[PDB]
């Protein structure tokens, strides 16, 4: 089997990105963000505090004739953004793009935090990092992929995210016509539980190569690029003006400049992440201070190739025996 959705940025900048997923007996269709960097599929439902609920499309149960309390199951998690969420567990059908998982866990929230209540557009996530992160206890769940696997046509699922435009999800092939030249296939450690890989180093613009080894993770569920402040102050240093501000939380610059390119290694090659991908705009509303896309990793532990990075490429997650990733140009 095999399955593609289409997945499309929530607002202008693209700071997350959502994707249709159909849940229960009629489908409910609920808006999800898919996160490679977390592993519990949870969504906004009728069993969630009804003052954390403000226009999201809700999950209930009780409407669907599949839907069945995983008796005893609860979750709880919390992401690198300091956001959160917990509630109870049903088993209930799922698709994504026409494949089909059934039994899977659908983890129904009864709090959010409050960057989830005033998010409207994103109704829960559907994680796709490795199942040893699940949150459910006390019994550990598998993600909608690893459940999916054995189904699937190839063990493998794809992100192709747009800028400033829709992208594509895909479960079970490699879609040879979204991507130029070949993919280049890199390591990945399962140590942590997420899609952590090995970038061969970096360049600013039309500068030289700087060949350097950066362990990070891909995350479609992170909006921005986290880098080391080594890496991260090269790049900023090319831009008139830009400066790291402690008020704003991380690089500013002025709104009139053009940014640089920045392009990152996997192995020998190489993926160029445009100057426009890298602007986040204004601050605050009519503000000249713009909010950067390259951010540093310090104090987070991690390096984080999140979507500013990820929608540079056709990225392949290779969930074979051995995992592996894989990065094209497009
Ligand atoms: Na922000």
Avoid: M
Avoid at 140 to 152: C, E, G, I, R, V
Avoid at 176 to 201: C, L, M, N, R
């Amino acid at each position: 089997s095999t399955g593609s959705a289409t997945t499309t940025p929530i607002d202008s900048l693209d700071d997350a990105y959502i994707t249709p997923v159909q849940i229960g007996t009629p489908a409910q269709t609920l808006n999800l963000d898919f996160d490679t960097g977390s592993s519990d599929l949870w969504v906004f439902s009728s069993e969630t505090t009804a003052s954390e609920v403000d226009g999201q499309t809700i999950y209930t149960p009780s409407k669907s004739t599949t839907a069945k309390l995983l008796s005893g199951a609860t979750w709880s998690i919390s992401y690198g953004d300091g956001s959160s969420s917990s509630g109870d567990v049903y088993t209930d059908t799922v698709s994504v793009g026409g494949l089909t998982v059934t039994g899977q866990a659908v983890e129904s929230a009864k709090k959010v935090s409050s960057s989830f209540t005033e998010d409207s557009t994103i109704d829960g996530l559907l994680g796709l990092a490795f199942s040893t992160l699940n949150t459910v206890s006390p019994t550990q769940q598998k993600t909608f992929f690893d459940n999916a696997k054995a189904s699937l046509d190839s063990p493998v699922f794809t992100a192709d995210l747009g800028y400033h435009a829709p992208g594509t999800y895909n479960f079970g092939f490699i879609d040879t016509t979204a991507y130029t030249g070949s993919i280049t296939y890199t390591a990945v450690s399962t140590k942590q539980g997420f899609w952590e890989w090995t970038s061969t180093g970096y360049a600013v613009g039309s500068g030289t190569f700087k060949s350097t080894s950066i362990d990070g993770i891909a995350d479609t569920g992170t909006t921005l690029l986290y880098l080391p402040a080594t890496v991260v102050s090269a790049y900023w240093a090319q831009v008139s003006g830009a400066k790291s501000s402690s008020s704003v939380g991380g690089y500013v610059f002025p709104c009139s400049a053009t940014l640089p390119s920045f392009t990152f290694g996997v192995g020998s090659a190489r993926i160029v992440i445009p100057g426009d991908y890298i602007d986040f705009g204004p601050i605050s509303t009519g503000s000249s201070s713009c909010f950067g896309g390259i951010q540093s990793s310090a104090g987070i532990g991690i390096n984080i190739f999140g979507d500013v990075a990820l929608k540079a490429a056709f990225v392949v997650f290779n969930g074979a025996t051995t995992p592996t990733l894989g990065f094209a140009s497009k």
